[PDB]
Structure 1
Amino acid sequence: DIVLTQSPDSLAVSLGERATINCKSSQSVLDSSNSKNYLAWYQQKPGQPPKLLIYWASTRESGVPDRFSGSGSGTDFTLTISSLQAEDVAVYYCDQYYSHPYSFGQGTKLEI
């Protein structure tokens, strides 16, 4: 089964700075036939459900601020917040839907 490991577990950045979160998959999630990486990124705040930010590893979801971006391929992915804003404080997760059982990373806490 595919396991996702995020780094770091907690990240603290100043207001307006760039935030980078990594996710490494034990196996590649890149479909060689369609060139798509079945990897998604989610944001979750206390008392609320997870919210999809990025899918196909680098495609931004509707409604998500443009400062959020995803990159990477195969087994190494990165979520980037170009300029951090107070409202970005939350827990971030990567999730693979390439092969069952689908699985989430352990989560990364982002604070100011």
Structure 2
Amino acid sequence: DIVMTQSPDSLAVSLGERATINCKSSQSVLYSSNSKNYLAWYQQKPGQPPKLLIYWASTRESGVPDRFSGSGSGTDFTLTISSLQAEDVAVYYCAQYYSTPYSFGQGTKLEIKR
């Protein structure tokens, strides 16, 4: 399976600050036939299942705020939250749906200082 490695494991920050998290895939998820990145980000709030946040590396899922921005390509991706809000506190996972079994990184937990 393709291995997804994220960093940092956990990120502490205060409300309103910018947050950036990285993700690297053991092999490229950029398909040479259509130039699309089969890379998604899922948001997992405490005690909840992972919910789709972003896909195609940079496309936002219905209902996701503009403050969330996915970028990167090939094997290196990044999720950026320009100004972290209270409702954004959760563990974020990058995942590849390039080839089965689709796989997840081990996540980055975003907390608010304390």
Q: Report the TM-score, using the length of structure 2 for normalisation.
A: 0.95
- 1-side partners of 2:50 and 2:99: how far apart? 21
- Report the CA distance between 1:35 and its aligned residue: 1.1
Any residues of structure 2 matched to 1:82-101 within 5 Å, and which?
82-101=82-101
Three-state SS of the structure 2 residue aligned to 1:93 is strand
**Counterpart-to-counterpart distance in 1, 2:23 and 2:48:** 23
* 2-structure distance, mates of 1:28, 1:13: 31
Cα shift readout 1:54-75 (whole Å, capped 9, x = no counterpart): 0000011111111111000000
CA–CA distance in 2 between the matches of 1:47 and 1:86? 16
CA displacement at 1:109 relative to structure 2: 0.5
* Deviation by residue 1:28-84 (Cα, 9 ceiling, x = unmatched): 000111110000001111222211110000011111111111000000000010101
Q: Distance in 2 between matches of 1:107 and 1:91?
A: 6
Structure 1 alignment gaps of length 5 or more: none
Identity of aligned residues (%): 96
Give the whole-Å Cα distance in 1 for the aligned partners of 2:104 and 2:59: 18
Structure 1 CA distance for aligned equivalents of residues 46 and 82 of structure 2: 23
The alignment partner of 1:17 has SS state of coil
Count of aligned positions:
112
Determine the structure 2 residue equivalent to 1:38. 38
User: 2:70 and 2:95 mapped to 1: Cα distance?
Assistant: 12
Rounded to whole Å, the distance in 2 between the matches of 1:55 and 1:86 is: 23
Whole-Å separation in 1 of the counterparts to 2:47 and 2:38: 27
Counterparts of 1:3 and 1:111, CA distance in 2: 25
Q: Structure 1 stretches (4+) deviating beyond 2 angstroms?
A: none
